[PDB]
From a paper:
The negative co‐operativity of the Bd1971ΔEAL cNMP sensor dimer raised the prospect of a potentially stable (intermediary) state in which the protein could be half‐occupied by a single cAMP—this is important given that there is little to no structural information on any intermediary state for other cNMP sensors. This form has two dimers in the asymmetric unit, each binding a singular cAMP molecule, the fold traceable until the end of the C‐helix (residue 114). Strikingly, the conformational cNMP swing‐out between the apo and bound forms is replicated to an intermediary degree in the cAMP‐occupied chain of Bd1971ΔEAL‐mid, with a rotation of ~30° and translation (at β‐hairpin) of 10 Å (aligned via C‐helices which again do not shift relative to one another). The nucleotide‐bound pocket of Bd1971ΔEAL‐mid reveals cAMP to be bound in the syn conformation; of the two full‐length, bound‐state structures of Bd1971, this pose resembles the cGMP complex (syn) more closely than the cAMP complex (anti).
Herein, we provide high‐resolution structures for an EAL enzyme Bd1971, from the predatory bacterium Bdellovibrio bacteriovorus, which is controlled by a second signaling nucleotide, cAMP. We reveal that regulation of c‐di‐GMP hydrolysis arises from a domain‐swapping of the “regular” cNMP fold, which undergoes significant rearrangements upon binding of stimulus, communicating a series of conformational changes over 40 Å to license a productive state at the EAL dimer interface.
Author numbering:
A (entry chain A): 4 to 114
B (entry chain D): 5 to 111
Write the structure that this text describes.
């Protein structure tokens, strides 16, 4: 059950401060990552097809650091913790080992 | 599968060395560290079933840190060719996660 979701142009996918449960892979369209500071919207990046966002919510299970809006009609593949564990557990030993030390390193970094 | 034993306090490799393979710790523990002006700054300690020395392989440059054995250790050698082969053949979503992790670790 790898589910997709379609998102209309100009839809806020999520907002800075929101609860974070999953990441998203862009299957079609583009998205704006941004912050809002005193009613002024400050862009950070634009992501397109085959790129992933919201991944700190996935590994660390905490709030959204930025807002994300769709610049056009987009499709998103939802990536949930259950999928990640399932895919890492079923992976090759060396790949599993790399994923572990990467995640362990990213936790020490973000301290 | 070739293994290698490393004596306690042996430098496995050093920051700045050429990087040809990674290692999975089969026995013992290892210290990952940097050296700044004869002062040694620890980063992490890894133990059994953990892997190091990947970064030279996937990013294709030198060793970013030094590694020493804290006790007698045994290491399974994983050649560069194996690591690239196994990561490239891995599942699309897993590859995508590894990329953004690495991109984050660089920033
Ligand atoms: N915080 C870290 N900084 C640099 N290297 C690290 C760190 N944690 C683990 N390592 C590992 O130490 C290794 C040092 O040589 P590599 O560049 O080949 O790959 C590195 C990583 O696998």
């Amino acid at each position: 059950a790898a589910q997709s979701v379609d998102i209309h142009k100009d839809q806020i996918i999520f907002s800075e401060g929101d609860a974070g449960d999953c990441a998203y892979i862009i299957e079609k369209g583009r998205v704006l990552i941004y912050l809002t500071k005193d009613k002024e919207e400050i862009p950070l990046t634009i992501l397109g097809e085959g790129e992933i966002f919201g991944e700190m919510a996935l590994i660390d299970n905490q709030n959204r650091s930025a807002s994300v809006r769709a610049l056009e009609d987009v499709r998103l593949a939802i990536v949930t913790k259950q999928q990640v564990l399932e895919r890492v557990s079923t992976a090759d030993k060396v790949v599993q080992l790399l994923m572990r030390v990467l995640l362990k390193r990213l936790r020490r970094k973000n301290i």
